[PDB]
Design a protein around this motif. Structure first.
Motif, PDB file in Angstrom:
ATOM      1  N   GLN A  13      57.248  17.378  14.860  1.00 39.99           N
ATOM      2  CA  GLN A  13      56.030  16.976  14.249  1.00 39.99           C
ATOM      3  C   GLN A  13      55.440  18.129  13.391  1.00 39.99           C
ATOM      4  OE1 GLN A  13      52.322  15.586  16.374  1.00 39.99           O
ATOM      5  NE2 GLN A  13      53.081  13.797  15.361  1.00 39.99           N
ATOM      6  N   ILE A  14      55.149  19.265  14.127  1.00 35.24           N
ATOM      7  CA  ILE A  14      54.808  20.404  13.547  1.00 35.24           C
ATOM      8  C   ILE A  14      55.659  21.600  13.719  1.00 35.24           C
ATOM      9  CG2 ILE A  14      52.716  21.939  13.192  1.00 35.24           C
ATOM     10  CD1 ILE A  14      51.247  19.669  14.667  1.00 35.24           C
ATOM     11  N   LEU A  33      53.710  28.125  16.031  1.00 36.17           N
ATOM     12  CA  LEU A  33      53.638  26.969  16.655  1.00 36.17           C
ATOM     13  C   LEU A  33      54.527  25.721  16.438  1.00 36.17           C
ATOM     14  CD1 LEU A  33      51.571  25.367  18.696  1.00 36.17           C
ATOM     15  CD2 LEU A  33      50.708  24.458  16.854  1.00 36.17           C
ATOM     16  N   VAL A  35      55.643  21.661  17.604  1.00 38.82           N
ATOM     17  CA  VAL A  35      55.243  20.666  18.287  1.00 38.82           C
ATOM     18  C   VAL A  35      56.367  19.693  17.958  1.00 38.82           C
ATOM     19  CG1 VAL A  35      53.310  18.448  18.533  1.00 38.82           C
ATOM     20  CG2 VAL A  35      52.469  21.019  18.078  1.00 38.82           C
TER      21      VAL A  35
ATOM     22  N   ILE B  35      46.687  20.847  15.715  1.00 43.84           N
ATOM     23  CA  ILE B  35      47.519  19.908  16.109  1.00 43.84           C
ATOM     24  C   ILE B  35      46.860  18.607  15.958  1.00 43.84           C
ATOM     25  CG2 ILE B  35      48.701  18.676  17.944  1.00 43.84           C
ATOM     26  CD1 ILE B  35      49.109  21.298  19.521  1.00 43.84           C
ATOM     27  N   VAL B  38      46.419  17.156  12.352  1.00 49.59           N
ATOM     28  CA  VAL B  38      47.926  16.375  12.013  1.00 49.59           C
ATOM     29  C   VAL B  38      47.839  15.131  12.890  1.00 49.59           C
ATOM     30  CG1 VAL B  38      50.247  16.637  12.094  1.00 49.59           C
ATOM     31  CG2 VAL B  38      49.072  18.438  11.612  1.00 49.59           C
ATOM     32  N   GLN B  39      47.491  15.063  13.937  1.00 51.98           N
ATOM     33  CA  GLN B  39      47.787  14.009  14.984  1.00 51.98           C
ATOM     34  C   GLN B  39      46.540  12.830  14.892  1.00 51.98           C
ATOM     35  OE1 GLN B  39      48.587  15.149  19.125  1.00 51.98           O
ATOM     36  NE2 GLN B  39      50.445  15.634  18.730  1.00 51.98           N
TER      37      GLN B  39
END
Lengths: 54, 55
Positions: A13-14, A33, A35, B35, B38-39
């Motif tokens: 995802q990342i 990072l 993810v 994060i 994005v989420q």
């Protein structure tokens, strides 16, 4: 492990990398990072020999 | 002047004063997590507008 590709799934995802200066020293700082996630979506589609092997 | 005989003398002049203190220091300080950006389902720009509205 013996499996069919359709039996297990993975998502990235990342995935990023970043450059900074250190607050406490004359240094560069590099940080990254990642993810992600994954599941055996069909458990009977994956066969494991020596499953307790560690 | 008529009750004072007809005498006069100079009084000292004076001031009053008030101080405008520039003594209010107020701040806003927050994280938007990379994060979470994005989420979540949409924009998070609204937190910057909400921070400005709070000040």
């Amino acid at each position: 492990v013996a499996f069919h590709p359709s039996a297990a799934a993975y998502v990235s995802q990342i995935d990023t990398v970043e450059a900074l200066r250190d607050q406490d020293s004359f240094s560069d700082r590099i940080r990254a990072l990642h993810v992600y996630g994954g599941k055996v979506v069909r458990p009977t589609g994956v066969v494991v020999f020596n499953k307790t092997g560690s | 002047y008529k009750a004072a005989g007809r005498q006069t003398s100079a009084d000292a002049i004076s001031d009053t004063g008030v101080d405008l203190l520039i003594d209010q220091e107020k701040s806003i300080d927050f994280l938007v997590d990379d994060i979470d950006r994005v989420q979540v389902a949409g924009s998070l720009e609204a937190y910057t507008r909400a921070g400005a509205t709070a000040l």
